[PDB]
Amino acid sequence: AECSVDIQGNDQMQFNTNAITVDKSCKQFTVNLSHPGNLPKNVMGHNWVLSTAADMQGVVTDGMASGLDKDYLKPDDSRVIAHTKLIGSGEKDSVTFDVSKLKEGEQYMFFCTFPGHSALMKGTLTLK
Numbered sequence: 001a002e003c004s005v006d007i008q009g010n011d012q013m014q015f016n017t018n019a020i021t022v023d024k025s026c027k028q029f030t031v032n033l034s035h036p037g038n039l040p041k042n043v044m045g046h047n048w049v050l051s052t053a054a055d056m057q058g059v060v061t062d063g064m065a066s067g068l069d070k071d072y073l074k075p076d077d078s079r080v081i082a083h084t085k086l087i088g089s090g091e092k093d094s095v096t097f098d099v100s101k102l103k104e105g106e107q108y109m110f111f112c113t114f115p116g117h118s119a120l121m122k123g124t125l126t127l128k
C-alpha cells in the first residue's frame with residue numbers, strides 16, 4: 001500500500017514477502033507485522049529488522065547473543081535502521097521509520113533475528 005506494507009510471519013518460519021519496495025516520495029515507511037498460526041514467542045517468535053545487507057550478519061549474531069528477554073536483538077544496535085519487537089502467534093507489532101535513513105546505491109535487508117530464523121526469514125528492501 002502507500003508508504004506501508006503488512007507482513008506475516010507464520011508457524012513454518014516464513015514471511016509472506018521477500019521483497020519490499022519503498023517509494024522514494026515517502027517521508028517515512030511503515031511495516032505492520034502479524035503472526036498467523038498458534039505457536040508462541042519462545043518457540044516461533046518473529047520480528048522484522050532492517051539493516052544494510054553488509055550489516056545483517058553482525059545484527060543477527062549479536063541478536064542471538066542478546067537472549068530471548070531482549071527479543072534476540074542487541075539493544076541500541078547502531079546498525080539496526082528500524083525494527084519491531086519479537087512476537088508470537090496472534091500478536092501484532094509495527095514500526096515506522098524515516099525514509100531519509102535510506103540511500104540509493106545501498107542494499108538493504110530485512111530479516112528476523114530469532115535463532116536460526118534468518119536463513120529463511122529474510123528479504124530485500126529497496127528504495128525506488
Ligand SMILES: [Hg+2]
Nearest residue numbers: 045046112117
Ligand atoms: Hg522468526
Ligand SMILES: [Hg+2]
Nearest residue numbers: 053056057109
Ligand atoms: Hg544476510
